[PDB]
Design a protein around this nucleic acid. Structure first.
Ligand SMILES: [Mg+2]
Ligand SMILES: [Mg+2]
Ligand SMILES: [Mg+2]
Ligand SMILES: [Mg+2]
Ligand SMILES: [Mg+2]
Ligand SMILES: [Mg+2]
Ligand SMILES: [Mg+2]
Ligand SMILES: [Mg+2]
Ligand SMILES: [Mg+2]
Ligand SMILES: [Mg+2]
Ligand SMILES: [Mg+2]
Ligand SMILES: [Mg+2]
Ligand SMILES: [Mg+2]
Ligand SMILES: [Mg+2]
Ligand SMILES: [Mg+2]
Ligand SMILES: [Mg+2]
Ligand SMILES: [Mg+2]
Ligand SMILES: [Mg+2]
Ligand SMILES: [Mg+2]
Ligand SMILES: [Mg+2]
Ligand SMILES: [Mg+2]
Ligand SMILES: [Mg+2]
Ligand SMILES: [Mg+2]
Ligand SMILES: [Mg+2]
Ligand SMILES: [Mg+2]
Ligand SMILES: [Mg+2]
Ligand SMILES: [Mg+2]
Ligand SMILES: [Mg+2]
Ligand SMILES: [Mg+2]
Ligand SMILES: [Mg+2]
Ligand SMILES: [Mg+2]
Ligand SMILES: [Mg+2]
Ligand SMILES: [Mg+2]
Ligand SMILES: [Mg+2]
Ligand SMILES: [Mg+2]
Ligand SMILES: [Mg+2]
Ligand SMILES: [Mg+2]
Ligand SMILES: [Mg+2]
Ligand SMILES: [Mg+2]
Ligand SMILES: [Mg+2]
Ligand SMILES: [Mg+2]
Ligand SMILES: [Mg+2]
Ligand SMILES: [Mg+2]
Lengths: 273, 90, 43
RNA sequence: GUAUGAGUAGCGAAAGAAGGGUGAGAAUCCCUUCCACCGAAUAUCUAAGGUUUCCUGAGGAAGGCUCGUCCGCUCAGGGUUAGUCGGGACCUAAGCCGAGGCCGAUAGGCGUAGGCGAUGGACAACAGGUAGAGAUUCCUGUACCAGUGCUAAUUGUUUAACCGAUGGGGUGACACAGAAGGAUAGGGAAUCGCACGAAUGGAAAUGUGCGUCCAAGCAGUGAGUGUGAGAAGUAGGCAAAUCCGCUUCUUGCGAAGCAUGAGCUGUGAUGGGGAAGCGGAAGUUCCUGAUUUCACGCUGUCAAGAAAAGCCUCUAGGAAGAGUAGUACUGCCCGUACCGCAAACCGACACAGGUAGAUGAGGAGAGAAUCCUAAGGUGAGCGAGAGAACUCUCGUUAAGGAACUCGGCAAAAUGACCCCGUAACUUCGGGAGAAGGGGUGCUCUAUUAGGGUGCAAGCCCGAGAGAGCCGCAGUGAAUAGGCCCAGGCGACUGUUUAGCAAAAACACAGGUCUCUGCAAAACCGUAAGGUGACGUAUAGGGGCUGACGCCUGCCCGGU
């Protein structure tokens, strides 16, 4: 659920949060943790190449398998946990061997359920199969581009996709953005929907919370000088005195398309978003 | 190179005062360790060394008219011998 | 008043020392120039 | 090089006085007494930085904003001692270098294995003494860590004592806020000890002054805080595992057991420290009580909070010697002087500026505020004497009370604690300490009524009431909101032109448009390689608007 705050301060007036009712434990799995360091949008050369990044709470990386390789061995859902590195929650799986893993928590995943991987798996939320064993019309997530590489598409909280049909070596999928795409039939996917679907209703409330999440302020191009932006200059407030609005580097930025014109995957895309 | 590890004794008021407690002050070259000093002393003087302490001294800045320089660096060792041992005359 | 010079032995050695000059072609060029002029202190 | 201004400006925040001494010479150097200043510092440690400025004996050309017999100045001799402290021989972070490698007119750029790199992790010593200069370093007592030989017993020999990974696993190993406890440090009263017992009206004791202890180690204990155990079996842990992980059974409980733990007690101590006169007295009981420690222990929250070594265990392996007790011996390199809120560091100066951390007493007090003091430290490197204008920093003013001025600028006024009382409007939180009124000292009832502590003795805290007393005045000093009405702008906290502008400007949470299917778009770079992102359309980049409420109309001819 979404928890609202009483207006005891001007900073808490419109602020909403999550109640974390799905989180069953607050202690991560020590052997699956790796260190993360902030890069703040800096390069090999140490130069700022992406703006508005830097200076949040420190985090620690949790290793997650997007591959789902362990076929045949049953796995039990042990914990549902908070992950600082993504918008979804994660689930800890105990395998009957004695091996522990982290996966993306799907909608309707509960502690105590059992999940499988492979061809003999059933079509049930949390199982991973190959795209040619998944019937038409089912909602999937964690789709992989290349076989054996790991899920790449539809991984953020609340997202989902459907199977639309076969053509033999490929399968038609409708992605979360509405685009229809062709994927190899030997690529894997997980049945269900990603499970933190209320994430988009949260109202940040303060500038400080944004600074906590690692975001630096953004300055409009109109209040700069002419040597910094194509929109800078003028006496008082000024309109966009150009044929089109511009980016800080030239390059029209309202309706102008940026996908490469001679791009190699244009033969696997049936309908554009 | 026992005679190279030990250069000369040190004769001041403090060293002369501690001479009566079976402690002898020497100037040693600037690369020798405590153990080397101990074995050089035992070979040169035929005593039984109980302990060695060492310290380093920087050179002092001096002037003699339009010309300024430094004196030499020094390494100074105090050697104390066992109670049942002979003494060094100085 | 905080002034511009705030000394540090290590920082001085790491930015202007002999081994920092010897690590680049332009630093060795600086050393060669200072040797040609005849200065007593290089780096 | 030398004049003029000119014996003029200045002599860099501050309390001194007298008596002795030294000397050729004294406001200025030394000693004594009295007075004054700081005291969450102007006291004590200690990093950085400086580099001999440290001590002793001589000196007075120059330096010292005056003088100088003096000096951080000149000359000559001295002075810094470590198995345990801080660093290396131990570990790693950001970052840097980088065999082969990839990329590129040259030069070179990037990067793997590997390696450096603390501001962090691990790691064994305490208490006294030291009169020119060093002290957890020297010396005196009493220890600990790692090793070595020599003795004396014990035990083992390839179904193999014992050792054991450069490998597996566990630990190491981590945020922020809140509250209540235990203990100790600290503070204070009695008691006890030593001395005095008094100048001017009084006091031989309800008089005054000073003091009323001691480690590490070793042995015991301990407020407590976490806490489930046993047995079988193994698609996993690159091989193996008796170790871990997982599963199933029996067993289950504020009762134990196990791991941790501040402190306390005995020894250390026939020692040390210590007044009164070499000598060396007393060292008890009670109250108060942490900003320290138990301890990130408990509870709560979202923004979800290093690594590696080390240590322990497991096998793979190595193996005929091994441990045990006692003794004696072994333990390297670098730093160590002195200044360190400052005359020794950064500011050209013996410069009203700046400079990380630890400690930081009493009365009154919520307090590290405020005023006066303790321990400790200072009297500030030009003076004396007159008491004009004018300038500066201060204190009071009759009657009036903004008439001043661009403008109440500046100044004056309010201010603590307790009680009563409190408006429009509102997003229901606020507005609000709104506004406006009243009270406040001391004595007796009174070692109170009642509380805390204690076995008691006793010690600490302590209202309501009555009766009185005195001043012009009772938070009698210092420190401690002025308030109200109405309008523009920007919702708000925040940011900005170092050195003329702090804002109505920027940011902001929210809104909307647009691009992007992942070798994503976008951005840096010739490229390789990167950021985006160890992310995946509830995500990421760009444009405009700027909380919230009601809304955002017509035009696609032109670009
Ligand atoms: Mg980083
Ligand atoms: Mg840049
Ligand atoms: Mg941005
Ligand atoms: Mg913009
Ligand atoms: Mg497209
Ligand atoms: Mg030695
Ligand atoms: Mg030295
Ligand atoms: Mg020395
Ligand atoms: Mg060159
Ligand atoms: Mg002149
Ligand atoms: Mg005098
Ligand atoms: Mg000198
Ligand atoms: Mg002078
Ligand atoms: Mg002068
Ligand atoms: Mg004289
Ligand atoms: Mg001198
Ligand atoms: Mg050491
Ligand atoms: Mg090393
Ligand atoms: Mg240690
Ligand atoms: Mg032995
Ligand atoms: Mg380890
Ligand atoms: Mg007393
Ligand atoms: Mg087991
Ligand atoms: Mg005394
Ligand atoms: Mg006490
Ligand atoms: Mg505390
Ligand atoms: Mg060595
Ligand atoms: Mg040494
Ligand atoms: Mg040394
Ligand atoms: Mg000092
Ligand atoms: Mg007060
Ligand atoms: Mg004052
Ligand atoms: Mg005093
Ligand atoms: Mg009166
Ligand atoms: Mg008064
Ligand atoms: Mg600004
Ligand atoms: Mg809002
Ligand atoms: Mg936007
Ligand atoms: Mg990444
Ligand atoms: Mg967007
Ligand atoms: Mg933008
Ligand atoms: Mg516009
Ligand atoms: Mg509103």
């Amino acid at each position: 659920a979404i928890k609202k705050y009483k207006p005891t301060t001007n900073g808490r007036r419109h602020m909403t949060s999550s109640d974390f009712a799905e989180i069953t434990t607050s202690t991560p799995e020590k052997s699956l943790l790796r260190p993360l360091k902030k890069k703040a949008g800096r390069n090999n050369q140490g130069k700022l190449t992406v703006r508005h990044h830097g200076g949040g709470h420190k985090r620690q990386y949790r290793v997650i398998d997007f591959k789902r390789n362990k076929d045949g061995i049953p796995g039990r859902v042990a914990t549902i946990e908070y992950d600082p590195n993504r918008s979804a929650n994660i689930a800890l799986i105990n395998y009957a061997d004695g091996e522990k893993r982290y996966i993306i928590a799907a909608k309707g995943l509960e502690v105590g359920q059992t999940i499988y991987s492979g061809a003999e798996a059933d079509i049930k939320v949390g199982n991973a199969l190959e795209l040619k064993d998944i019937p038409v019309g089912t909602v999937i997530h964690n789709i992989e581009m290349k076989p054996g590489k790991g899920g790449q598409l539809v991984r953020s909280a609340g997202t989902s996709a459907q199977v639309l049909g076969k053509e033999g070596k490929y399968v038609l999928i409708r992605l979360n953005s509405g685009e229809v795409r062709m994927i190899l039939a030997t690529c894997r996917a997980t049945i269900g929907q990603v499970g933190n679907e209320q994430h988009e209703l949260i109202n940040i409330g303060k500038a400080g919370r944004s600074r906590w999440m690692g975001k630096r302020p953004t300055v409009r191009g109109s209040v700069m000088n002419p040597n910094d932006h194509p929109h800078g200059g003028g006496e008082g407030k000024a309109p966009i005195g150009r044929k089109s609005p511009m980016s800080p580097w030239g390059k029209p930025t309202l309706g102008y398309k940026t996908r490469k014109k001679n791009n190699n995957s244009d033969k696997f895309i049936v309908r554009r978003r | 190179d026992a005679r190279d590890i030990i250069k000369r004794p040190v004769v001041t008021e403090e060293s002369t005062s501690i001479l009566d407690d079976k402690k002898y002050t020497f100037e040693v070259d600037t690369r020798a360790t405590k153990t080397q000093v101990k074995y050089a002393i035992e070979e040169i003087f035929d005593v039984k060394v109980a302990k060695v302490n060492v310290m380093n001294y920087k050179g002092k800045l001096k002037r003699m008219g339009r010309y300024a320089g430094y004196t030499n660096k020094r390494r100074k060792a105090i050697v104390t011998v066992t109670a049942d041992s002979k003494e060094i005359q100085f | 008043m905080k002034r511009t010079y705030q000394p540090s032995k290590r920082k001085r050695k790491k930015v202007h020392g002999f081994r920092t000059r010897m690590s680049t072609k332009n630093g060795r060029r600086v050393l060669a120039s200072r040797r040609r002029k005849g200065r007593k202190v290089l780096s």
